[PDB]
């Protein structure tokens, strides 16, 4: 479908999406960094049961969960569920088989593009250093 997607795509819903991105672990109300991550990434609507990540795979991809819920799973056993505002994958092959619990919207990025954004943000770099305690 695109009902969720449609709530977010186009110049029309640019604000709502940017607004959404800021309320993420990594962005932490750094707007410039979202506006960049907005441009860098591709919105995807995901059906209930739809896999964004096979585990054992080498997807450099990392998804911002903008709306809905993702069920992390390892070796057959449910782990966490990430939700609106969180992210999935990395920061080695793939840890977990992430899948969608209900309709979910994500923003998909490549490790590569991600870090050239990462690496230019004093703000993010500062925030990853603070969380580096043993």
Residue numbers in the entry: 1 to 91, 98 to 140
The study reports:
The NpPycTIRCNBD crystal structure in the space group P6522 contains only one polypeptide in the asymmetric unit (from residues 1–91 and 98–140), forming a central six-stranded antiparallel β-barrel surrounded by five α-helices. The loop connecting β5 and β6 and the last ten amino acids at the C-terminus are unresolved in the NpPycTIRCNBD crystal structure owing to structural flexibility. Structural comparison of NpPycTIRCNBD with PsPycTIRCNBD shows r.m.s.d. of 1.1 and 0.9 for 116 and 117 Cα pairs, respectively. ITC results showed that both NpPycTIRCNBD and PsPycTIRCNBD bind tightly to cUMP with nanomolar affinity at a 1:1 binding stoichiometry. cUMP also showed strong binding to AhPycTIRCNBD and SmPycTIRCNBD with dissociation constant (KD) of 8.2 × 10−7 M and 2.7 × 10−7 M, demonstrating that PycTIR is a high-affinity cUMP receptor. The Pycsar system has two types of downstream effectors: PycTM and PycTIR. This study provides the structural information regarding the bacterial PycTIR in both apo and cUMP-bound states. The binding of cUMP by PycTIR is probably an example of induce-fit: cUMP induces the conformational change of the helix and promotes the dimerization of PycTIRCNBD, which subsequently strengthens the recognition of cUMP by inter-subunit contact, including the specificity-determining residue N143.
